[PDB]
Curated annotation (Swiss-Prot):
UniProt-recorded name of the protein: 1-phosphatidylinositol 4,5-bisphosphate phosphodiesterase gamma-1
Residue numbers of the full-length protein present here: 547 to 789 of 1290
Chain segments annotated as coiled-coil in the UniProt record: none
Domain SH2: residue ranges: 4-110, 121-209
Domain remark from Swiss-Prot or TrEMBL: The SH3 domain mediates interaction with CLNK. The SH3 domain also mediates interaction with RALGPS1.
Known role: Mediates the production of the second messenger molecules diacylglycerol (DAG) and inositol 1,4,5-trisphosphate (IP3). Plays an important role in the regulation of intracellular signaling cascades. Becomes activated in response to ligand-mediated activation of receptor-type tyrosine kinases, such as PDGFRA, PDGFRB, EGFR, FGFR1, FGFR2, FGFR3 and FGFR4. Plays a role in actin reorganization and cell migration.
Subunit organization: Interacts with AGAP2 via its SH3 domain. Interacts (via SH2 domain) with RET. Interacts with FLT1 (tyrosine-phosphorylated). Interacts (via SH2 domain) with FGFR1, FGFR2, FGFR3 and FGFR4 (phosphorylated). Interacts with LAT (phosphorylated) upon TCR activation. Interacts (via SH3 domain) with the Pro-rich domain of TNK1. Associates with BLNK, VAV1, GRB2 and NCK1 in a B-cell antigen receptor-dependent fashion. Interacts with CBLB in activated T-cells; which inhibits phosphorylation. Interacts with SHB. Interacts (via SH3 domain) with the Arg/Gly-rich-flanked Pro-rich domains of KHDRBS1/SAM68.
Species of the source: Homo sapiens
Modified residues (Phosphotyrosine): Y224, Y226
Length: 232
């Protein structure tokens, strides 16, 4: 499901963010040479760049994108042309890339750590009091949100459990997120697990809260009523 596709990386700092992302994944996990990602190009409108690992250095290759006869054509060199980025990546995963100086096959994909950012339950800027206030407006067990904390790589799941509002501390520790001692690959994956399994005393993550969700359910400032999550 396009794990290696990162889209736009802020602005056209995108090259440096790619490099950072790759150095982080490759050094923490001990990834092989050829570990990569695809993102939008900084210099070439409508093209992409394939950024990959080479023993501490990262190589950038332009993936030219044509619309010829209303049929997208992604390619690295005029000689070999593809129909999808999946085919190109999957082909260069098997056949080695020719880059003049060296040759290299694409290895493992470097995944995004920030898919949570677009999710409805995610607030990049919400104090604990602001989470509590919004959670008081939803008198429902299972109502939740994920809020970013002031420190980098630190979050909280703020939820309504048995009428009270409690808070769980989540920590991004490199390429995984930690909830106490429980480890997940991402904040997204943690939330999916806790939508199916109880986060705190038989309470699952049921209703994601934001301003739109409040217009639907939500009331007008009612009920004036950190915690350990369930392991596994």
């Amino acid at each position: 499901n396009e794990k290696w596709f990162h889209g736009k990386l802020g602005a056209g700092d995108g090259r440096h963010i790619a490099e950072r992302l790759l150095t982080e994944y490759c050094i923490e996990t001990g990834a092989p040479d050829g570990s990569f990602l695809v993102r939008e190009s900084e210099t070439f409108v409508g093209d992409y760049t394939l950024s990959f690992w080479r023993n501490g250095k990262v190589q950038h290759c332009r993936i030219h994108s044509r619309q010829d006869a209303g049929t997208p054509k992604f390619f690295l060199t005029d000689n070999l042309v593809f129909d999808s980025l999946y085919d190109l990546i999957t082909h260069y995963q098997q056949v080695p890339l020719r880059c003049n100086e060296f040759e290299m096959r694409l290895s493992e994909p470097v995944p995004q750590t920030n898919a949570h950012e677009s999710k409805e339950w995610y607030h990049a800027s919400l104090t604990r009091a602001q989470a509590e206030h919004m959670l008081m407006r939803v008198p429902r067990d299972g109502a939740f949100l994920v809020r970013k904390r002031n420190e980098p790589n630190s979050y909280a799941i703020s939820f309504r459990a048995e009428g009270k509002i409690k808070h769980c501390r989540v920590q991004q520790e490199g390429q995984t997120v930690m909830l106490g001692n429980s480890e997940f690959d991402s904040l997204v994956d943690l939330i999916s697990y806790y939508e199916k399994h109880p986060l705190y005393r038989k309470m699952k993550l049921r209703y994601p809260i934001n301003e739109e969700a409040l217009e639907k359910i939500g009331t007008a400032e009612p009920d004036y009523g950190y915690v350990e999550a369930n392991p596994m």
